[PDB]
Amino acid sequence: QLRCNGVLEGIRICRQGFPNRIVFQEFRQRYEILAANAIPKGFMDGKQA
Amino acid sequence: FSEEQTAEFKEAFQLFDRTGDGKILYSQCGDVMRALGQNPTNAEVMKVLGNPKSDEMNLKTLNFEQFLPMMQTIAKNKDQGCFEDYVEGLRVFDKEGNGTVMGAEIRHVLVTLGEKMTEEEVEQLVAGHEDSNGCINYEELVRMVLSG
Amino acid sequence: SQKPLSDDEKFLFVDKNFVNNPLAQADWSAKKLVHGFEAASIKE
């Protein structure tokens, strides 16, 4: 029914777009351990961290 | 691994001797190669020895001639993980990345990650390195366990 | 909304592991869990 509602397609379409969105501070938590190395999680710069 | 600290290695080797024959139990010679400037887990403490079984680990002692292979096989670690990786990984591990980890949760991931240490091991780790907060500061904790 | 306690929002609730913390190879594996679909951490 998702495909029947296009919602399988709507999900692919979120994927066809930006499906997920790792929040800045989510990115900082998630990726201080992952290659930040001067950027502890909860770092200061939303973008630059 | 040079044959000049062979003297130091024989020294600490006999330091944790119990049979008293120039021959030291493999878990014992393993804690030996630990306190010889290294920080290996009892798991690798055993395995580095040509993989002695728990019988060989604490019954068939180590002839120092094969402790020279063991000093080789322990000198691979010489220490443990990076303290910046320690801090970033115990920050990302900690649910907020504040700077410490619950003595609950730190003793947890010390008995619930990697080699499941005796809780006395994670305690003499955590206790004696605790901040009396219950969120035992893995920074002070890890580091004084690193030096000690 | 997210209310498992209210069947008025249980179907609206969001039942899932909420760790959202950088540790989920403590409730799961790097191996990728998963119609007839089998939640299969990619073992081989």
* Amino acid (1-letter code) at residue A6: G
Return the closest-CA partner of residue C23 out of B113, B120, B75, B65: B113
Residue B116 · residue B42 · CB < 8 Å: no
Residue B62 · residue B26 · CB < 8 Å: yes
* Amino acid (1-letter code) at residue A18: F
Q: Identify the closest residue of chain B to C23 by CA–CA distance.
A: B93
Contacts of B95 in chain C (CB under 8 A): 21
Cβ-proximal residues to B146 (8 Å cutoff; 6+ apart), any chain: B39, B79, B80, B83
Residue whose entry in the numeric block shows the structure tokens 């989510």: A26
CA dist B71 and B3 (Å) reads 10
The two tokens of residue A3 are 């495909």
Report the half-sphere exposure of B88 (CA within 13 A, side-chain side).
19
Q: Identify the closest residue of chain C to A41 by CA–CA distance.
A: C22
Using alpha carbons only, what angle is made at residue B120 by residues B119 and B121, rounded to the nearest 5 degrees?
85
CA dist B23 and B14 (Å) reads 7
Residue whose entry in the numeric block shows the structure tokens 């790097």: C30
Contacts of C22 in chain A (CB under 8 A): 29-30, 32-33, 41
Q: What is the resolution of this structure in A?
A: 19.0
B45, with CB counted inside 10 A (0-12, 13-18, 19+), is buried
- DSSP per residue, B1-54: --SSTHHHHHHHHHHT-SS-SSEE-HHHHHHHHHHTT----HHHHHHTTT---H
* Amino acid (1-letter code) at residue C10: K
What is the separation, in whole angstroms, between the first and last Cα of chain A?
Answer: 42
* Amino acid (1-letter code) at residue B7: A
**A39 in contact with C, Cβ within 8 Å:** no
The two tokens of residue B27 are 């878990």
> Technique behind this structure?
cryo-EM
Q: Which of residues 11-40 of C touch A (CB under 8 A)?
A: 20-22
When scoring B82, B86, B92 by the number of chain A Cβ atoms within 10 A, the one with the most, hence best to mutate, is: B92
Residue B63 phi, psi dihedral angles, 5° rounding: -70, 130
- At how many degrees (to 10) do helices B83-93 and B103-111 cross? 110
% helix, strand, coil for chain C, step of 5: 10, 0, 90
CA B23 to chain centre: 21
Number of Cβ atoms within 10 Å of the Cβ of B70: 25
- DSSP per residue, A15-36: HHS------HHHHHHHHHTTTT
The two tokens of residue B65 are 């001639």
Residue B100 · residue B137 · CB < 8 Å: yes
Q: Identify the closest residue of chain C to B109 by CA–CA distance.
A: C26
The two tokens of residue B64 are 């120092």
